[PDB]
Amino acid sequence: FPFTLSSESTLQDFLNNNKFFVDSIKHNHGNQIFDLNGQGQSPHTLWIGCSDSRAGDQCLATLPGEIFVHRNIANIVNANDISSQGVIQFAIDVLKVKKIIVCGHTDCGGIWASLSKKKIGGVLDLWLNPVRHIRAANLKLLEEYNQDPKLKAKKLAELNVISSVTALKRHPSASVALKKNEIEVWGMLYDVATGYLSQVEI
Amino acid sequence: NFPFTLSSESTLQDFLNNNKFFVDSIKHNHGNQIFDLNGQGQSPHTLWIGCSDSRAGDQCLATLPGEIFVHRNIANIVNANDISSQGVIQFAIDVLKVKKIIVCGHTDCGGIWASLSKKKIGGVLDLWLNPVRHIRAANLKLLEEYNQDPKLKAKKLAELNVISSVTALKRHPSASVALKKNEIEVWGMLYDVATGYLSQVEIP
Amino acid sequence: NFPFTLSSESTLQDFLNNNKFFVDSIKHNHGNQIFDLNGQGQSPHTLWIGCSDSRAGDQCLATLPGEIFVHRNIANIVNANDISSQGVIQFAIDVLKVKKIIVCGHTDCGGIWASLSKKKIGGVLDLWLNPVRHIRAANLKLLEEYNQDPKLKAKKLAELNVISSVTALKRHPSASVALKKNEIEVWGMLYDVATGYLSQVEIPQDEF
Amino acid sequence: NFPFTLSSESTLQDFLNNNKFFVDSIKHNHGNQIFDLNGQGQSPHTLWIGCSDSRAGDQCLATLPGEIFVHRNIANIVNANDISSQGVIQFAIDVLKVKKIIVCGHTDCGGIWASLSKKKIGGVLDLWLNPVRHIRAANLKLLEEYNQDPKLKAKKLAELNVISSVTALKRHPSASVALKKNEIEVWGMLYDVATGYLSQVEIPQ
Ligand SMILES: [Zn+2]
Ligand SMILES: [Zn+2]
Ligand SMILES: [Zn+2]
Ligand SMILES: [Zn+2]
């Protein structure tokens, strides 16, 4: 379409996009940024967000070596998910990030599925359980946005962000550094139709 | 406090200023066309599995929002016991019907280097990395026809790890059916953190 | 050696000798009927989830082969991202169509004791047991009401753990459906290691 | 009703009653001695890893409580990335110091039959069973030599699966150190569901 790449696009087409990424960085910064990249990483921020192609840490327009990223379906931080827990562990314990952003977004597939109770199948029903819990736990509140789907899904999306932030703060290395005031934590919402990022109230 | 767009000392406002740029930048080049398409759904053409590392993101493909479905974790490990990986893989193929999948490791991977050391890492990480530890053991001293240079051992390990993840990805139910119907293609790649260059890994 | 049927020093043939007795015993009491049924397929009426502990097995229910579908792991933890447990539950409900599910903890459970401590174990077990450490953390005050007797404290955590596993089990997509259709029944239980007796664990009423 | 002790329509009291029998039966033969030992701790000599199947089951060894540490899961898969199994093995070897580990497959195993097809099962089971589908693929020419009797096809696969599980078990760090110290024995077995009999599987060495 109006996108840089397509289904039909070739391997070389991909490598052309990548040669552009290098040329652009080099054009604005010389070799200095890859020289830094190539010695170590010292990112300032951990971003935890949905896997969704339209959400994504891109929205912050940072350079390589600024943001440590974890992305998964519906930006769920669960204590038993070893994928999340390693990333958080490593981010706080090794990289010493000073900010953590948990970012959800509008039109989230996990959020919408969790509202309409038809079993998705495979492993997805299990993966989404905590969201299905969050909806059940907040039924009255959600009910008050009943008269508009997109807003109910959005309220749920926000509740999910808050849920993930609490779980994040209860992480052992997080909880320590948080109370030593070494770290800062934010919930956010990404608006898919506008590209704007707003802060969730916590 | 950097040649980077943000530092540790930045503000919520500063952050939000970067995002205002992102939006203005997209609008400058494309008008509302993207955020209009985005706002009515996603139809990405590619799934990207790579490392969480702040240098080796999918950014290195310079795509716009709406093109690439992403998962990132420590050392780009794909395992069938991991409901996170498999959930993503499943959704991408069956629902989103992505036509390309990319597994990307990269040079200077902390997970890979740790997998090469003696020192127990601690917590959940040492367990997380066991799959890589197994790959080192499963590959001779093919790893160190190179113990003359640390960096090359790391790179070969990283590539073996990519190959590991790719094979696993291919044995996924959705993947094996898609690949047999020739309805999807699969790539393993390495990002050189020092150069910004992506390259292909040959998959056996 | 010595009250027990087999020992460390036992032999393969000794084990096979026990198995010979198991076969002869069932044929003595039921003739050939059971092994003929077994041989034609399984139709168990119950799923049992309990701890691996050698003292606490489903044999405490004195059933014959073909009755009880069994999963056993350390501290009878049922967690929604553990593919082992969730496969067992999906299969039992969907395919076997069990009518009863029992989640059964027990007293002197080592997973419980380990979780009451703060000392790290090692290997996988500190992470396996993490759900239990959480339950203990979320009931800290309730539990410290049993500082008078550590044994009763551990017994309480064993119960909370049962309650946690059951609740997770019921949130399984196959289970939640079967339940709301009243096609299945779910029991928390506790097994007293010292008496061989099985008690029912009171499970919270439906709250969401 | 059945020829089995309990039914789909059996009650809670009814279950408690079979448990009451269990207790009575054991004190009848052994006094309070088993439960006294039990009550103080556990010292099992054997770890059993086997299938969840209601017909299989470590009861085929006719042991008293306190002898055998048990793990059971679908098709008795011992996989290095499966933490349920890996915890059981660690604890058994490192803490309980079991002297024997037994991996037991069985005939008519539903996980085996499902791995013989490549029809998708759905939910989680395609993933769970993947390492067995692998085994099928890597032994295809062999398993097809059993085409005319599907049941002996499933038996061979169930034996291959046992060999694979035992191989993974022995690569467990606890196991490996124990194995090299001649501190433990590991056995593959198969359980014939139709006959109640247990046989040994020849494992490579
Ligand atoms: Zn989403
Ligand atoms: Zn890395
Ligand atoms: Zn126990
Ligand atoms: Zn079976």
Author numbering:
A (entry chain D): 27 to 228
B (entry chain C): 26 to 229
C (entry chain A): 26 to 233
D (entry chain B): 26 to 230
Task: Provide the authors' own sentences about this structure as they appear in the paper.
In the present work, the crystal structure of N-terminally truncated CA from the pathogenic yeast Candida albicans (Δ29_CaNce103p) was determined at 2.2 Å resolution. To obtain crystals, truncation of the 29 N-terminal amino acids was necessary. Δ29_CaNce103p forms a homotetramer organized as a dimer of dimers. CaNce103 is a complex of four identical subunits organized as a dimer of dimers, in which the dimerization and tetramerization surfaces are mutually perpendicular. The subunits in each dimer are interlocked by their N-terminal arms, consisting of two perpendicular helices stretched from the rest of the molecule over the neighboring subunit. The active site of Δ29_CaNce103p is formed by the catalytic Zn2+ coordinated by Sγ atom of Cys 106, Nε2 atom of His 160 and Sγ atom of Cys 163 located 2.3 Å from the acceptor atom. However, in the present structure, a molecule of β-mercaptoethanol originating from the crystallization buffer fills the fourth position. The contributing residues, most of which are hydrophobic (monomer providing zinc ion ligands: Ile 129, Gly 165; neighboring monomer: Phe 146, Leu 151), create a narrow tunnel, which serves as the only point of entry to the positively charged active site. The substrate tunnels have similar shapes and orientations, although the middle part of the Δ29_CaNce103p substrate tunnel is rather narrow compared to those of other fungal CAs. At the overall structural level, however, Δ29_CaNce103p is more closely related to CAS1, which also forms a tetramer. However, the conformation of this segment remains unclear because the first 54 amino acids of CaNce103p were not visible in the crystal structure.
